[PDB]
Design an enzyme around this catalytic site. Structure first.
Site, mmCIF file in Angstrom:
data_model
loop_
_atom_site.group_PDB
_atom_site.id
_atom_site.type_symbol
_atom_site.label_atom_id
_atom_site.label_comp_id
_atom_site.label_asym_id
_atom_site.label_seq_id
_atom_site.Cartn_x
_atom_site.Cartn_y
_atom_site.Cartn_z
ATOM 1 N N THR A 1 -12.669 7.455 -13.145
ATOM 2 C CA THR A 1 -11.684 6.953 -12.201
ATOM 3 C C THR A 1 -12.069 5.624 -11.533
ATOM 4 O O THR A 1 -11.245 4.991 -10.875
ATOM 5 C CB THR A 1 -11.343 8.059 -11.134
ATOM 6 O OG1 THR A 1 -10.062 7.784 -10.554
ATOM 7 C CG2 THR A 1 -12.410 8.136 -10.043
ATOM 8 N N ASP B 1 0.811 -1.214 0.000
ATOM 9 C CA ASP B 1 0.000 0.000 0.000
ATOM 10 C C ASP B 1 0.851 1.274 0.000
ATOM 11 O O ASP B 1 0.559 2.226 -0.722
ATOM 12 C CB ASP B 1 -0.935 -0.019 1.207
ATOM 13 C CG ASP B 1 -2.135 0.877 1.021
ATOM 14 O OD1 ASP B 1 -2.805 0.752 -0.033
ATOM 15 O OD2 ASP B 1 -2.410 1.699 1.925
HETATM 16 CA CA LIG Z 1 -8.998 5.478 -9.818
#
Ligand SMILES: [Ca+2]
Ligand SMILES: *[C@@H]1O[C@H](CO)[C@@H](O[C@@H]2O[C@H](CO)[C@@H](O[C@@H]3O[C@H](CO[C@H]4O[C@H](CO)[C@@H](O)[C@H](O)[C@@H]4O)[C@@H](O)[C@H](O[C@H]4O[C@H](CO)[C@@H](O)[C@H](O)[C@@H]4O)[C@@H]3O)[C@H](O)[C@H]2NC(C)=O)[C@H](O)[C@H]1NC(C)=O
Ligand SMILES: *[C@@H]1O[C@H](CO)[C@@H](O[C@@H]2O[C@H](CO)[C@@H](O)[C@H](O)[C@H]2NC(C)=O)[C@H](O)[C@H]1NC(C)=O
Ligand SMILES: *[C@@H]1O[C@H](CO)[C@@H](O[C@@H]2O[C@H](CO)[C@@H](O)[C@H](O)[C@H]2NC(C)=O)[C@H](O)[C@H]1NC(C)=O
Length: 475
Positions: free
Chosen positions: A466, A340
């Protein structure tokens, strides 16, 4: 080969769809370890709506019809939780609009439910109407966290860069489809303060701006520059709006070009132990913070898209380097899935990771993986733009690494440490972008060409939001 791989992705998606319908539908999402349910997205059934564009592309009519019947019964005016304008826009608003454009075009002959199809736009209209009061502020810059019943908010004085800059695509698209210009107007007014940054100290390098904007007057409130969470999708949408309508958004395109160039000149970063690797760093009043996030890997894909559309070989080249850096974080761990967050500051390398940093080029900060798609996404654009098979193969290795590490009896689970056998421990969590993004990019990378596939040059007829929902380009 490719046909078998595409079919295998369909199977993994089907596996998750079955477990979700079995233990959670109509709640927002399945809890994959306890085989239960959760509602992290206002309870309107986020996994079902996010799944729509992917089911249509994969050709699963049963899954599409079940989702179309579900949309018809949603009441977007009611929810017992506070509402995020940003999340609600990129998942719900865009997911219904994409399904409509896909079903009203390249997939017209997939189902007989024109009435349920038409309702996808009707419901998109209703959702925007319930949300719009968020934009009714002094400047036009909205409150991202509202209460759709009282019209109250969290009392914030500023609104983030990405949450303010990642709404114009879906909101403008609804106006072009309904004929009511109010949606295009409200979102574009908020976007305006970002294209003409003020004070100038909030734009440290050409096209790179601060991370916060005063809701009161539209002026930025800090000078921190970055492509990480909080900022990311703002830059992403600049170029994508040009692809949507190059006529109307040539100015967005110009603002992205400056941003791309200043990023190559200032944010570019090479770890001391691994000089052949490239990452982007953060910048604050002359200091460079050498760390990044999985989220940030969406970056190579943006450079590659602006690259092919604008025939700029230098942006394409820089994009591939970011792709290599991200591939590096993936193939350096035991599970072959990347972390991450990570860092490469020579002065802060943890002694226990000393060996690892020396060979891989970075040290891990947060080893969890929450079923994110930003890396597969960019691996997908590289393959579409260059045509090289190596990028397609990198999508398959990642997909397979996830299916063996994260799969459960009902679906897939987030994991605690990508550098431990089996990923350490599984989290009782499965985000809706597992259906929308992870399964769509993995599939599209091995499937037949079509209008919805990303294209080279100026040949794109669709443009991805997105949350991986393809939108038909204007007129
Ligand atoms: Ca995205
Ligand atoms: C685990 O992860 C690593 C890190 O990403 C992977 O290794 C990278 O793999 C990519 C893909 O092949 C490599 O990219 C290619 O590098 C070639 C060699 O570059 C070196 O030599 C040239 C000499 O001119 C130098 O300029 C350069 O600085 C390097 O020293 C290039 O020739 C390739 O470019 C060609 O193809 C591309 C299209 O792919 C075109 O755009 C170019 O114009 C040109 O035709 C390309 O750049 C990358 O170098 C590797 N990085 C590292 C750090 O090793 C591993 O493959 C991966 N492991 C597994 C198991 O997959
Ligand atoms: C959103 O605002 C509404 C205000 O209308 C809040 O609901 C009220 O909550 C109080 C708290 O006990 C109740 O006594 C009222 O009866 C509620 N009014 C109505 C009409 O429901 C609600 O709490 C807010 N939602 C969130 C998530 O904060
Ligand atoms: C993804 O994981 C699934 C399940 O672990 C794999 O499918 C299983 O494959 C084994 C043989 O390896 C079979 O005995 C099982 O019947 C399969 N399970 C089911 C329910 O289909 C699958 O091969 C993996 N996908 C890829 C591409 O590796």
């Amino acid at each position: 080969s490719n046909q078998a791989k595409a079919d295998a992705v369909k199977e993994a998606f089907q596996h998750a769809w079955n477990g979700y319908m079995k233990y959670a539908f109509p709640h927002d999402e399945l809890t994959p370890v306890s085989n239960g349910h959760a509602d992290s997205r206002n309870g309107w059934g986020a996994s079902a709506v996010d799944a729509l564009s992917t089911a249509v592309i994969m050709g699963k009519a049963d899954v599409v019809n079940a989702i179309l019947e579900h949309v018809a019964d949603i009441d977007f005016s009611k929810t017992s939780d506070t509402v995020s304008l940003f999340e609600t826009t990129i998942r719900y608003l865009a997911g219904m609009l994409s399904g409509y454009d896909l079903l009203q075009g390249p997939a017209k002959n997939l189902v007989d439910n024109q009435d349920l199809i038409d309702g996808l736009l009707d419901q998109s209209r209703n959702l925007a109407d319930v949300l719009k009061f968020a934009f009714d502020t002094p400047s036009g810059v909205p409150y991202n966290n509202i209460n759709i019943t009282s019209h109250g908010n969290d009392g914030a004085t500023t609104n983030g860069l990405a949450v303010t800059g990642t709404l114009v695509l879906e909101w403008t698209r609804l106006s072009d489809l309904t004929g009511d210009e109010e949606y295009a107007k409200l979102s574009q007014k908020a976007e305006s303060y970002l294209l003409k940054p003020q004070p100038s100290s909030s734009e440290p390098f050409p096209g790179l701006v601060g991370s916060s904007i005063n809701i009161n007057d539209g002026q930025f409130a800090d000078s921190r520059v970055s492509w990480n969470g909080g900022d990311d999708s703002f830059y992403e949408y600049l170029i994508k709006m040009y692809v949507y309508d190059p006529k109307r958004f040539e100015t967005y395109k110009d603002r992205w070009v400056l941003a791309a160039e200043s990023t190559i000149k200032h944010l570019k970063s090479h770890p001391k132990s691994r000089p052949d690797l490239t990452f982007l760093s953060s910048y604050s009043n002359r200091n460079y913070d050498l760390s990044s996030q999985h989220l940030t890997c969406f970056d190579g894909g943006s450079f590659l898209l602006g690259g092919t559309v604008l025939d700029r070989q230098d942006f394409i080249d820089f994009g591939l380097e970011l792709v290599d850096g991200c591939e590096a974080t993936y193939n350096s761990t035991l599970t072959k899935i990347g972390p991450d967050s990570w860092g490469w500051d020579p002065k802060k390398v943890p002694s226990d990771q000393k060996e690892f940093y020396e060979k891989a080029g970075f040290y891990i900060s947060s080893g969890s993986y929450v079923l994110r798609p930003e890396v597969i996404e960019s691996f997908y654009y590289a393959h579409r733009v260059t045509g090289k098979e190596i990028y397609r193969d990198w999508v398959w290795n990642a997909f397979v690494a996830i299916n063996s590490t994260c799969r459960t009896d009902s679906g897939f689970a987030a994991v605690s440490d990508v550098n431990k056998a089996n990923g350490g421990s599984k989290y009782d969590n499965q985000e809706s972008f597992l259906f929308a993004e992870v399964m769509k990019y993995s599939y599209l990378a091995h499937s037949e060409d079509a209008a919805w596939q990303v294209q080279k040059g100026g040949k794109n007829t669709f443009v991805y939001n997105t949350e991986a929902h393809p939108i038909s380009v204007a007129r």
